[PDB]
Design a binder for this molecule. Structure first.
Ligand SMILES: [Cl-]
Ligand SMILES: [Cl-]
Ligand SMILES: [Cl-]
Ligand SMILES: [Cl-]
Ligand SMILES: [Cl-]
Ligand code: NA
Ligand code: NA
Ligand code: NA
Ligand code: NA
Ligand code: NA
Lengths: 310, 310, 310, 310, 310
């Protein structure tokens, strides 16, 4: 029994995150636990304060027409839980439900660890006989409770883009709001825990340049390579999968490449030494001692700028 | 209380994916979140626009006969959620539910990474006293929302094969539509991340051909073999299980075989050198230096053609 | 309000697997998605075709007495979903529900990979005042849809043992049918993927018999042992846990035993060589070169016959 | 509407395990699938066999007063499913529900693998105006179906301690029965699969005592130590976590300690040999050859007795 | 139909943990299974003991007004299960439900293993036309059953902070109680299982200081480094992820740093020895033998005090 008039029905909306949690990097989902606040005008149940004796009149949800607002990027039926429905005398209705749902928003991992994400929560409504359109009421959208937290993330801001998207969909108009939760990662624990030790085991690999012992060198470079793979396995949890070209993935690939050309160098130095041209051998090792750290430092700087300064 | 007439009842159907997600390579399932749109003629509730005063008359689902359309390859009861039921005056009924369900469709991994899949969603309906038959209405089947995504996949097309399958089943006719979601994988991140490093550790194993030191060689080939297994463990996540003969599984098996015959070679060179026939030894190593990369490049080319050009 | 007469009430039953899936080797469960078809005589609602005008009369499940058929080995409340209830005029009732449940049936892993399993689905019904007994109707038990699949398994047959088990249980008779889904494993992908590489790394271990260098030998045998454990970790996914004495577990244990006695041999050859009896040393190695592969081939043949030919 | 009389209301209880499954060593839970059988006297619905014409009168659960029996150590709302309620003429009521629930009972891992556990299922009931007390009826408690199984466990016995615990709780009497499922582990598969290979890799470590080559020895002892950690990783699944001092944890710790003092020994032998006192070196190695296996055998015997004979 | 009077409505509350379980270090959640006890005055259903004949009058939850108390930090709809509602003659109502819910409370890992946590359970209630305020009744808050246990934790105390938080929220007053479950970890099993073996493999690394053999030394230090990473992988389960600067993470990082500077030392000793200044080489090794254990002991002491004494 929808409200009837000469104009499209506007439904004011607001979201208020009480809790947000479980940012699943793998499934690209995150659970949320919030207030939904709908408000719209329905003159059909507008009433008299004086004859009825009360400034505001509450109703059970079965009793009156409540618009079919629905989340779009939500993986399951939401845990709907009505908290209040109250009608002002002019027929404005104010509805407030608590809800929780796991939301599906894509994450972009290219600048990880130093990435930042912008999670989305969409809301559609579909038209009936009246055209129907949603819009944001900011006093009730200021959705962050002060206690909200994503462990490992700084929660920058919770806002909504005020202009609804409206479009044809299976021969009816539909209106869609985009709420946005913006976050940036807490990278620094990674420096002690991931980047420094990989660099250490890489440096141990470079020690072989001051050795001339081919068996000491192969044992050196290849055993460090095993250590490197083992350690990569150790931190495999903090290196989420993408089809995309990640930054960290880049520097890691580059490290495998350094293990490779170090093996090539050790082999060349041993071949030259075996062919009785010790001069070229020890010149190539003595040169490598500068070359490897430097080309690394350059390749890191290029690769850093290429992802961040671009 | 089914509609009654002289003809089999046709039910027009349409699906509209709002979101699809969670392509679980292991379980061969994928979750989907879509519109179902049923439409069929029921003259029994056909009505007069003029006496009733309205062009279209809505009904609650309890009120009227709605056909038992059911998914076939769905792992659980679907999260049904009716959005609209409306009746046109001639008695055509148009029904629209939102639903989400994890769908079970087999995946074929033989050409992985470069595979493509064609996920299915089946729809049966079972006959009552009237014969009952489903058919696709394309204006409401054009199921992709522009925002649909499977991370790591390009979503090619969403279509339905218009001819229903109809068949006897426990002494009743049944009608079955096959909707098809076609996808191809985003392989390229694999090149930096999986194939190149395996090839590097394999090349490091081939370095042993320029060495004559048996201890340097065993340490070389066997330590690279450990590194190889470690690395295979590292990417174990991106190498899904099959009973079938995979392409990537083929090249991997072939790599183990190369580690084996390299060990055989190193051993032969050392045995020959120990038996005072250094000429045959260093001839076999000097030969290996060409043979190994080449037979590899051939064996890869054969193996590639065998899976792709066949 | 149960049907009343002078005889035990027979309930005809049938199962029709639409889908089966998720054979969880760990939990020894497997999900199934099928038709249940109950049929039984109730003269109390037998009726007149002519006065009522219809050959068959449908009823909602609340309206009439439907026997409490229940699965036994099912881990949760089943997803019951009634599809049809129809009454023939003599009072025979034909009931058909779609259902899905994860079923608990033990698996026997002793001959794995080459095992075969026989999953079970039991059905009990408990007596009221009438004695109650189930029995199978084969036309509705032929439960395989042609599309049914367990990835990695050939689905041999779906049948039911026609004689019910009937027994006292807490002072009432109970009747129990046993449906049986028989399957055999798709082993062959394992040969390239598990058994050949383990054999290769074992052969690399045997290379040490042609070496006399004690450091080359320890590095050889012990580094292959690390590789072996690493590789076992790699395929740990395809080696399911049992309290029972597995065949594959046997050959694996035997491989560890071969690494051990190879270490013992290498040590003996080195001790003999150190005590100035080179003849006994090189005789023991030269002997080992035949002994190890042979005793292996024997021990595998015995072990194979012991599990399969017994 | 509770039964009223001059005495505390006794409720006879019985449990009948139809299936038990999913002994989760980690969560210390286990799922169970059984009969609950309640029986109690209610004269208010006692009735006349002759005027009513029937020996026993069934009732729907809504119709009459059924005591609030509740499980204590159960992690979720139980899957309640009433099977029968029947009233004898004197007013004794016999109630029988099927149920399944995952139960939380602590496990004691100190003697693992050879441990045995005693899982619990508690039942409380809370008093109303009548005092209320539970007690066990053994004919309906004999809860094992012959088919019950916990893979990897022998199921010793299912019994209940007949004396209820009764106590004040928030100003009301409460009665609590403790049913007990006793089990002992199937250890033997562990001998081939865990303990023997660890012992082998440890013995390989002791081989170094017959070597004087320091590089051979460090490669020996340290490479076996890597193998040991790898293998411990391989069986990490069968070594469940505790805050408590496990037996298997003890022997494992002791093994690490043996790797350590073997490294210390190899180092001392090399230091003595380097300081031109070969006599003390080879005396210490020759002594170690006996000492290590022996102190191990003693330390294992002490440790075994300390956990089992204590 | 809320109670009406001149004062804000107080609702007395109490929680009684029957069981608590599943402390998930990763998700920072923990399941709980408890009593909720609400009590509040409603004169509208106050009644006469003498005319009605009973001291206390029970009601079904549908019958009367029960306040919307709701958990805040709970991840799903709670498994509500009403046990009793009883009304005293003056109109005080006493309500008691059993419930279970997984609770979301952050954990602080900085002092792990030796950490202690303080889990929270919040309770809000939102105002209607009457102002509404919660407060704790201690006789019914004493929530620990004697049997409660978190394996690996000592359960210190269960209490509630008696002063409610009250605040504006979307134009209504809200009241919020904070129950607190305090716990401290059972660390000691970690000493045999994690810290001692890491220290052992580190000491093995220090053995290299008494060796002058560069190949023995590289094999020593780098192979212990592989062992260290392997072992870290082995205990990866007991080292939970944080964005924060953990203590155990600190000592682990410091251990990687010791492997690094030990490699640097071994390299320096070999370079000095190669440049014909053996005096400086063996002086640096002989110095290292004291330096490494000492700086370690200091750095551990500083690090310990920095986390604990600060
Ligand atoms: Cl050399
Ligand atoms: Cl050599
Ligand atoms: Cl030698
Ligand atoms: Cl030596
Ligand atoms: Cl040296
Ligand atoms: Na891992
Ligand atoms: Na893995
Ligand atoms: Na694995
Ligand atoms: Na593991
Ligand atoms: Na692990």
């Amino acid at each position: 029994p929808p409200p009837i008039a000469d104009e499209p029905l506007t439904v004011n909306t607001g979201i208020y995150l009480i809790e947000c949690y479980s940012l699943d990097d793998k499934a690209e989902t995150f659970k949320v636990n919030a207030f939904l606040s709908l408000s719209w005008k329905d003159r059909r149940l507008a009433f008299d304060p004086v004859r009825s004796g009360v400034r505001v009149k509450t109703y059970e949800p079965e009793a009156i027409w409540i618009p079919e607002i629905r989340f779009v990027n939500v993986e399951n039926a939401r845990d709907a839980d009505v908290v209040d429905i109250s009608v002002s005398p002019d027929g404005t209705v104010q509805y407030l439900e608590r809800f929780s749902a796991r939301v599906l928003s894509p994450l972009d991992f290219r600048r990880y660890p130093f990435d930042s994400q912008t999670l989305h929560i969409y809301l559609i409504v579909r038209s009936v006989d009246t055209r129907n359109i949603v819009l944001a009421v900011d006093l009730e959208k200021v959705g962050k409770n002060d206690d909200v937290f994503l462990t490992g993330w700084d929660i920058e801001s919770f806002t909504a883009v005020v202009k609804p998207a409206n479009f044809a969909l299976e021969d009816r108009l539909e209106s869609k709001l985009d709420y946005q939760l913006r976050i940036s990662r807490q990278y620094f624990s990674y420096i002690p825990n991931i980047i420094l030790p990989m660099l250490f085991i890489l440096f141990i690999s470079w020690t072989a340049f001051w050795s001339t012992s081919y068996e000491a060198n192969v044992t050196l470079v290849v055993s460090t390579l095993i250590a490197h793979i083992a350690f990569n396995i150790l931190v495999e949890t903090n290196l989420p999968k993408t089809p995309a070209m990640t930054y960290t993935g880049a520097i890691i690939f580059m490290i495998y490449l350094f293990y490779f050309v170090a093996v090539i160098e050790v082999t060349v130095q041993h071949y030259l030494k075996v062919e009785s041209q010790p001069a070229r051998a020890a010149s190539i090792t003595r040169a490598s001692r500068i070359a490897f750290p430097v080309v690394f430092l350059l390749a890191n700087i290029i690769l850093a700028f290429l992802f961040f300064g671009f």
